[PDB]
Structures are given as structure tokens and as C-alpha cells.
């Protein structure tokens, strides 16, 4: 940090340092411990927020860090979604069903609806980032696709376990594991995807819709996804094939309605 | 005047009971409704680990007397209260002395009616800083501590009241920030949704308005 | 304008010019607002009274020293006592309640039996009906000198009340068209007699449950020995209207008095307890560990004596089994036989 001389470069290096610290916080996860998992997620959210403040301070008209800002925002939102989902899994035992009362666990049902909505929106925003990142290389696109696939995996797990296991006529049985992965991170992500998918199928009908096993498997999937470290790619640091559109036109303006 | 410590809220978010046992008595009193609702109710999880945790919770909260009043508040049938609240809401479309002299169901009825009235007043209006629409939240615990516990129970059992609208209503209460804090503490998963609901009102600083 | 008028009135009242008519009218023009349900009205009335009037409890000397030192104090003392007795149930601040209690203790119209009975009745309503304020006045979290002072004052009031009732002779005209049907004739084991209000009895026993005051305990011990002698039958009262067994110790009061740390109270209460009441009591919370152990011991004795009826009275043995298990985990002694009976209809279940 001391060697640098400019402002935006200093903020960029500081933001990278904070993101690295936040991800090193993610490495403290251990299997089946959910309290420590939520603690680590919260600490990483703190470091990510500091990092994104520094990063959005680094943006300038020359080379505005658009992809980095959006990618970090989506990472923060995904981690926040995981934190809220862990909070709901804890709320299953923290907020017992009302004596008035699969609508028995009304609060849990509504919270899972909100979680599904949030993860669907996150997947849509990751797709929007994918479409916007036209300049990016193949590796960056595959990484963003993996993030979107993680979001869709959590959403589908929520759906199958809670909202409608009857509607879960999934044909996931196939040659998914035989895919040629081009990176260690991608291969680990696909492996955890396959493991979570086969875990969901075994619990499709074996328990009541708001069983403790559903939340257990769900948060196990969350900590399993978060166990592997986030990997950045080329377009985060080095941008190539920079193409834009001037988009001139022929125009505070008014015109006759007849014409 | 006291506020729930951050350690206690983190403990309830993490649902670990040993540190809850290690927690001090006033914080336990603050968080008492959720703890009472935890044990002596349906198992929900039906897991032996949660059974041991419930055993520890029951051991923890046995050493205080207010839980007797809380269980008395829980024993009241909520079907009649649900019908009364719905009928009052459809029809619409001293308080502390009565509070002291009322039993559990009448307490629930009167405070729920007041909360529904304040919610409707806030929703109908444009949120033009309704300073104080009630005077049943005074310093003595008869209007402050038992009232807050009862409000937590009301937010729990008749779930028709969403946490966000209750949160919006509580802002207009004279001493409503404390009620909001303890209510969010008793429902740990609700933090970000109530924050989202509150943040969506007021663009600028309102010229430092009340 | 208002301040100058108030200052002129101050001179017109504090000096010798004060007389019965002016003082009574001025006081009545503000005393009526004390009983008003409006909190602001009573606050303004009390503040105006303090303005007109003017180390331990230095901020309350206006009621202890200034207000009694009035030439016309005796004339309006009954009116002041009545006004405070009406406003004691309306007003809510614990410290103001403490000040009112101390003033009533010092400035009671003791000479008239009716006024003493009415004051005792109102204090009993405070003790019984108002529980949260009672919790504030004797908060175990932060015991204070004021709490001990008001506890001693209440003990003194009740002790002098029972002492005055002891002086009552047999065959007097006390038996008349009593305005309350709750009046009950109390007869002690040692042959003493008195007529009392059951609410005042409840208040007296509740005051004992709070424990001994740190400064003085002679009044507390005297009242305790009068009401609960050792190895002797306790006093019993019979309803004058029907001569039936008066419920001097209802279930809620018994449950409250188990919570008290005094061993004599809990030992006296536990005697001759039915299985349903025993189950209801052990279901409750907030009971100390030693008292819990005594509850379990009495449960064991009941199981050894009449086990067959205990089975029929239990709504759900699962909750009771869990409760005795967690109490044993807490370290409470006894209940092993009761736990064994509960586990009889609880065969082994699936492990994990």
C-alpha cells in the first residue's frame, strides 16, 4: 500500500486488501457448526463493506470500475442472503409456530418465500452482470455463471425442500459429473453442486415440509458453498477488448402531436 | 431504562444456550418473551439436540417470576381474539389503570386494539410525524415492561400483524424505539426486513424533522 | 402575570392571614385534580402544591417537613388523607407512592377506628391489586434505603392496626350492618379474637413474603409470630354471613408465599396440600432451589401415601417428567419416587 502514489490506485489496492481479508475470514468455516458460520459471514460482510466503500471511492471517469463494483455488490448481496437464510434456519427453532395454526409454520413459510424471492433476484442480477460483461474473457464469464448457478441451486433447494416437493419432478440424474472443468475452483463448485443436488433428492418426500432435516441440509449446502474460496478472474483486474457505442442521435425537446 | 446488549442478540441469532445461561438477569428479562415461547411449546424441530437445548433453556428461565405472567398470557385462546381484531378492523373501514385491573385476555384485547388503531392511523396518513397517538407507554413497568412483553407476544401469536407495519407504527410511540429494539431482539431473523421497511420512508433528512 | 399572582398567593397563605375558608377553598381547587385520570393534571397539581409549600430523601422534604408545619394542618389532615387514599390507586410513580406511604404512616388519623380501617383497606388494595408497582417498591435488583423505609412503615401500620383490633372486647357493637360482605371474624389458636377484612389479611401475609427489613425486624418478627406460631395451629377465620371455612390462603397466595425465602412461611403453607395444588405449584416457575426441594419431598410423601389418585389428576405426565428431570439437573433434592412413577408410563424410545 505504501509504494503507490495516486488516489484511485491507492483505494483500489486497499479494496483488494479488504476483499482478501474478507475471504480469508471465510476460510474459518467448519462443517456442521452454524453459529460460527454466521459469525464468520457477519465479519466477512463487515470487511466486504469496507472494501466496497474503498473500491467505489476508486472509480474515476477514466476506466470506471463498473464490473468490479457490480461483482462485489452481488457477492455482498449473496453473502447477506446466506446470512438471512441461516437466520431463518435458526428461526425455525427460535420462533415456534403460533397456537392459532403446510401453513402451520407460517412465519417460516413467509421467510422462505422472501428468501426464494431474494435468491431469484440475485440470480437475475448475476445474469444481468453476465450480459453486461461483453468485454470479459471466457474464464470470467464461466465464473459469473458459476455464481449464478450457486444462487439457482439454493433457490431450487428452497423450493424442493419447503414450498412444493410435489412440484419437484427434477430429472437431475445424468452425466453432470462427467463435465470437463477448466479450473480447480470450477471443478469444486460443480462437485458441491452435484453433492447438494443428490442430497436434496434423498429428502424430497422423506420428511414433513418444515422438518429440521430440510434446514439442516440447506445450511449444510450454504456452508459447503462458502467453504471453497472465491476466485477472481482476468476481467476483474485486466480489461481487454474494450468496446463502447457513441450512439449519436438527431434531437428540453418538443414536437407536434400530429407529426 | 435499559437496552438489550449486542452480545445477547448475537447469542439469540446463533441460538446457543450456554452463553444465554451466562447472561445477566436484566438482559434475560428483556429477552424473556422469546425464551418463554421457546420451551413449553411445540418441539417444531423434533431433534434431540434441540431437545437438550430446550432443556437448558427451561433450566435457565426457571429462576424468575415474570414467566408465570407470560405463561398466563399464553394460555388465552387466540381464536376469539383473532375474530375480535378482524371484526374491529373491518368495522373501522385511564388506560394504565385498566391495564393494572385487567386480566390477560382483556390486556391483549385493549393493547391490540390500540396498536391496530395506531397502525391504521399511520397507514391512512402520509406519515406526517404523528408525535404521540397514545399515552400507555409511561415509565412504570405496568405500562413499559409488561406492555413490551405483551407486545412481543402479540407480534408472535396473532401473526396477521406483519413485523414491518408494527415497526413503522412503533416509531410514532413516545418511547417506541426501546419497544422496537426488544421486539427485533425477540425475533432475530427480522432485522434486515424491518431495516428495509424503515429505510424506505423519508428521502432527505426532512430538514431535521421530528 | 401568573408568577406574580402565585407569589402574592404565597404570602397570603404562608403568613398568619391564612384561615379555614381561604385555605380550604384554594386546596380544594387543586386537590380534585389529584384523583383525575389525566397524568398531566395530577403532575401539574402536585407541582403547584410543591411551589405553594416551597441526608436521606432530601428532595422530598416538602412533604415530610414543610407540609405538616401548617397552622391549619389538623383541619385538613382528614381531607388530605382521604385525597391521598383516593389518588394512591390513580398515581403510578413508585417514589411518589413511597412518599405518600411515609406521610400516611407518620400522619395517620389514628384516633378514629373508621379512618384506620379505611386506610388499611386502601393499603391492602395497593398491595394486592397493584403488583408491578409492588415489584418496584421492593426491587431485589436494586434495594435502597427508601424501600426499607417504606417496608418498615407498612409493617408499622399493619402492626398498629392488628394491635388496635386486639383491644376489641367481646359483645361490643362492632357487629353491625357492615357495608362490606367480606368482613370475617378471626379467632387465634391462643383464644384471641378480632374482625378483619380478608384483603387486609392477604396484604399482611404478602408483606411478610418480601423478607426482613435490613434496619429493623422487631415488627416483622412480632407480626410473623402472631400470624405463624411454631408447632401450633394457625389462626382460622369463619365468614360471619354463613359460618363456613374462609379461604384465608387461596392458591395464588400460597404459590406467591412459597417463593418467599422465609422457611417458616413455606413450611406452614406446604402442610396439608392436595395433589392437584401440589402439581400446580411445582408447574410454576421462580421458586427457589430449597423450596423446590421441599416441593419434591412433599411430592414423594404424597406418592408414598396415595399414589393411585395422583395418576388420575395429571393432565400430561410428559411435561411433569421433563420438569422434574430439569429440576434434578438443577440440583434440587427429592422427587426420585415421583420421577419413577412418571417414567412408569414412559417406555424406552428411539435413540440418536
UniProtKB/Swiss-Prot annotation, chain A:
Q: Which GO BP terms apply? A: cellular response to ionizing radiation; DNA damage checkpoint signaling; regulation of transcription elongation by RNA polymerase II; RNA polymerase II transcription initiation surveillance; snRNA 3'-end processing; snRNA processing
Q: What is its main location?
A: nucleus
- Per the record, residues carrying Phosphoserine are 250
GO annotations of cellular component type = chromosome; cytoplasm; INTAC complex; integrator complex; nuclear body; nucleoplasm; nucleus
Localization recorded for this chain is:
Nucleus; Chromosome; Cytoplasm
- The domain of life for this entry's organism is Eukaryota
Its assembly, as annotated, is: Component of the Integrator complex, composed of core subunits INTS1, INTS2, INTS3, INTS4, INTS5, INTS6, INTS7, INTS8, INTS9/RC74, INTS10, INTS11/CPSF3L, INTS12, INTS13, INTS14 and INTS15. The core complex associates with protein phosphatase 2A subunits PPP2CA and PPP2R1A, to form the Integrator-PP2A (INTAC) complex. Interacts with NABP2.
Its biological function? Answer: Component of the integrator complex, a multiprotein complex that terminates RNA polymerase II (Pol II) transcription in the promoter-proximal region of genes.
Q: Which family does it belong to?
A: Belongs to the Integrator subunit 7 family.
| Official protein name in the record | Integrator complex subunit 7
Organism per entry:
Homo sapiens (Human)
Q: Which gene encodes it?
A: INTS7
Curated annotation (Swiss-Prot), chain B:
**Localization:** Nucleus; Nucleus membrane; Cytoplasm
Subunit field text? Component of the Integrator complex, composed of core subunits INTS1, INTS2, INTS3, INTS4, INTS5, INTS6, INTS7, INTS8, INTS9/RC74, INTS10, INTS11/CPSF3L, INTS12, INTS13, INTS14 and INTS15. The core complex associates with protein phosphatase 2A subunits PPP2CA and PPP2R1A, to form the Integrator-PP2A (INTAC) complex.
Function, as annotated, reads:
Component of the integrator complex, a multiprotein complex that terminates RNA polymerase II (Pol II) transcription in the promoter-proximal region of genes.
**To which protein family does this belong?**
Belongs to the Integrator subunit 2 family.
| Protein name, entry field | Integrator complex subunit 2
This protein's species is: Homo sapiens (Human)
Shown portion of the complete protein runs from: 15 to 241 of 1204
Curated annotation (Swiss-Prot), chain C:
Q: Which residues cross the membrane?
A: 193-213
Associated disorder, per UniProt? Answer: Neurodevelopmental disorder with cataracts, poor growth, and dysmorphic facies: An autosomal recessive neurodevelopmental disorder characterized by severe global developmental delay with motor impairment, cognitive delays, absent or severely limited speech, dysmorphic features, hypotonia and cataracts.
This protein's species is: Homo sapiens (Human)
The molecule here is called: Integrator complex subunit 1
Sequence positions bearing Phosphoserine: 352
Show which stretch of the intact protein is covered: 946 to 1318 of 2190
Family note: Belongs to the Integrator subunit 1 family.
Give a short account of what the protein does. Answer: Component of the integrator complex, a multiprotein complex that terminates RNA polymerase II (Pol II) transcription in the promoter-proximal region of genes.
User: Subunit structure, per the record?
Assistant: Component of the Integrator complex, composed of core subunits INTS1, INTS2, INTS3, INTS4, INTS5, INTS6, INTS7, INTS8, INTS9/RC74, INTS10, INTS11/CPSF3L, INTS12, INTS13, INTS14 and INTS15. The core complex associates with protein phosphatase 2A subunits PPP2CA and PPP2R1A, to form the Integrator-PP2A (INTAC) complex. Interacts with ESRRB, ESRRB is not a core component of the Integrator complex and this association is a bridge for the interaction with the multiprotein complex Integrator; attracts the transcriptional machinery.
Q: Which domain of life is it from?
A: Eukaryota
Q: Which cysteines are joined by disulfide bonds?
A: none
User: What taxonomic classification does the UniProt entry list for its organism?
Assistant: Eukaryota, Metazoa, Chordata, Craniata, Vertebrata
Q: Which gene encodes it?
A: INTS1
Q: Where in the cell is it found?
A: Nucleus; Nucleus membrane
Amino acid at each position: 500500500l505504501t509504494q503507490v502514489a495516486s488516489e484511485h490506485f491507492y483505494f483500489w489496492l486497499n479494496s483488494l486488501k479488504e476483499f482478501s481479508h474478507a475471504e480469508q475470514c471465510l476460510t474459518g468455516l467448519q462443517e456442521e457448526n452454524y453459529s460460527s458460520a454466521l459469525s464468520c459471514i457477519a465479519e466477512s460482510l463487515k470487511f466486504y463493506h469496507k472494501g466496497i466503500a474503498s473500491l467505489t471511492a476508486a472509480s474515476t471517469p477514466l476506466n470506471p470500475l463498473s464490473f468490479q463494483c457490480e461483482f462485489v455488490k452481488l457477492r455482498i448481496d449473496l453473502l447477506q442472503a446466506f446470512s438471512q437464510l441461516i437466520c431463518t434456519c435458526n428461526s425455525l427453532k427460535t420462533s415456534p409456530p403460533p397456537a392459532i395454526a403446510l401453513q402451520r409454520c407460517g412465519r417460516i413459510s413467509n421467510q422462505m418465500k422472501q428468501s426464494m424471492e431474494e435468491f431469484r433476484s440475485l440470480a437475475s442480477r448475476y445474469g444481468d452482470l453476465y450480459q453486461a460483461s461483453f468485454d470479459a474473457d471466457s474464464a470470467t464469464l464461466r465464473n459469473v455463471e458459476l455464481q449464478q448457478q450457486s444462487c439457482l441451486l439454493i433457490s431450487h433447494a428452497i423450493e424442493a425442500l419447503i414450498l412444493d416437493p410435489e412440484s419437484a419432478s427434477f430429472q437431475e440424474y445424468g452425466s453432470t459429473g462427467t463435465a470437463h472443468a477448466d479450473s480447480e475452483y470450477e471443478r469444486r463448485m460443480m462437485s458441491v453442486y452435484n453433492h447438494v443436488l443428490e442430497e436434496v433428492e434423498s429428502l424430497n418426500r422423506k420428511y414433513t415440509p418444515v422438518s429440521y432435516m430440510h434446514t439442516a441440509c440447506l445450511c449444510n449446502a450454504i456452508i459447503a458453498l462458502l467453504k471453497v474460496p472465491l476466485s477472481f478472474q482476468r476481467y476483474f483486474f485486466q480489461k481487454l477488448q474494450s468496446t463502447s457505442i457513441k450512439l449519436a442521435l438527431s434531437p428540453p425537446i418538443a414536437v407536434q402531436n400530429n407529426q | 431504562l435499559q437496552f438489550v446488549s449486542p452480545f445477547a442478540f448475537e447469542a439469540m441469532q446463533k441460538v446457543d444456550v450456554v452463553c444465554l445461561a451466562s447472561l445477566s438477569d436484566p438482559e434475560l428479562r428483556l429477552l424473556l418473551p422469546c425464551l418463554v415461547r421457546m420451551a413449553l411449546c411445540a418441539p417444531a424441530d423434533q431433534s434431540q439436540s434441540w431437545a437438550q437445548d430446550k432443556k437448558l433453556i427451561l433450566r435457565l428461565l426457571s429462576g424468575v417470576e415474570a414467566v408465570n405472567s407470560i405463561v398466563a398470557l399464553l394460555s388465552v385462546d387466540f381464536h376469539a381474539l383473532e375474530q375480535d381484531a378482524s371484526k374491529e378492523q373491518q368495522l373501522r373501514h385511564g388506560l394504565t389503570l385498566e391495564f393494572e385491573h385487567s386480566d390477560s385476555p382483556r390486556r391483549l384485547r385493549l393493547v391490540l386494539s390500540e396498536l391496530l388503531a395506531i397502525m391504521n392511523k399511520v397507514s391512512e396518513s402520509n406519515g406526517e410525524f404523528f408525535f404521540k397517538s397514545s399515552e400507555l407507554f409511561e415509565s412504570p413497568v405496568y405500562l413499559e415492561e409488561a406492555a413490551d412483553v405483551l407486545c412481543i407476544l402479540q407480534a408472535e401469536l396473532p401473526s396477521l400483524l406483519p413485523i414491518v407495519d408494527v415497526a413503522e407504527a412503533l416509531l410514532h410511540v413516545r418511547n417506541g424505539a426501546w419497544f422496537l429494539c426488544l421486539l427485533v431482539a425477540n425475533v432475530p431473523d427480522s432485522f434486515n426486513e424491518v431495516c428495509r421497511g424503515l429505510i424506505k420512508n423519508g428521502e432527505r433528512q426532512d430538514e431535521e424533522s421530528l | 402575570k401568573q408568577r406574580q399572582l402565585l407569589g402574592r398567593l404565597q404570602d397570603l397563605l404562608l403568613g398568619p392571614k391564612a384561615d379555614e375558608q381561604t385555605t380550604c377553598e384554594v386546596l380544594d381547587y387543586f386537590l380534585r385534580r389529584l384523583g383525575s385520570s389525566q397524568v398531566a393534571s395530577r403532575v401539574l397539581a402536585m407541582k403547584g402544591l410543591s411551589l405553594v409549600l416551597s441526608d436521606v430523601l432530601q428532595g422530598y422534604q416538602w412533604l415530610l417537613r414543610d407540609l405538616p408545619r401548617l397552622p391549619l394542618f389538623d383541619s385538613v389532615r382528614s381531607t388530605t388523607a382521604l385525597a391521598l387514599q383516593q389518588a394512591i390507586h390513580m398515581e403510578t410513580d413508585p417514589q411518589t407512592i413511597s412518599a405518600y406511604l411515609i406521610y400516611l404512616s407518620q400522619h395517620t388519623p389514628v384516633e378514629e377506628q373508621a379512618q384506620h380501617s379505611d386506610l388499611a383497606l386502601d393499603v391492602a388494595r395497593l398491595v394486592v391489586e397493584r403488583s408491578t408497582i409492588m415489584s418496584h417498591l421492593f426491587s431485589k435488583l436494586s434495594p435502597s434505603a427508601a424501600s426499607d423505609a417504606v417496608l418498615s412503615a407498612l409493617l408499622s401500620i399493619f402492626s398498629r392496626y392488628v394491635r388496635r383490633m386486639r383491644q376489641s372486647k367481646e359483645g361490643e357493637e362492632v357487629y353491625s350492618w357492615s357495608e362490606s360482605q367480606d368482613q370475617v371474624f378471626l379467632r387465634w389458636s391462643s383464644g384471641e379474637t378480632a374482625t378483619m377484612h380478608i384483603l387486609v389479611v392477604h396484604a399482611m401475609v404478602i408483606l411478610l413474603t418480601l423478607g426482613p427489613p435490613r434496619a429493623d425486624d422487631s415488627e416483622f418478627q412480632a407480626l410473623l409470630d402472631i400470624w405463624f406460631p411454631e408447632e401450633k395451629p394457625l389462626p382460622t377465620a369463619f365468614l360471619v354471613d354463613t359460618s363456613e371455612e374462609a379461604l384465608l390462603l387461596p392458591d395464588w397466595l400460597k404459590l406467591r408465599m412459597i417463593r418467599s425465602e422465609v422457611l417458616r412461611l413455606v413450611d406452614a403453607a406446604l402442610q396439608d396440600l392436595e395433589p392437584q395444588q401440589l402439581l400446580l405449584f411445582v408447574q410454576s416457575f421462580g421458586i427457589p432451589v430449597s423450596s423446590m426441594s421441599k416441593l419434591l419431598q412433599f411430592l414423594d410423601q404424597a406418592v408414598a401415601h396415595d399414589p393411585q389418585t395422583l395418576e388420575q389428576n395429571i393432565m400430561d405426565k410428559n411435561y411433569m417428567a421433563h420438569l422434574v428431570e430439569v429440576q434434578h439437573e438443577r440440583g434440587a433434592s427429592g422427587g426420585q419416587t415421583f420421577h419413577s412413577l412418571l417414567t412408569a408410563s414412559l417406555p424406552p424410545r428411539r435413540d440418536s
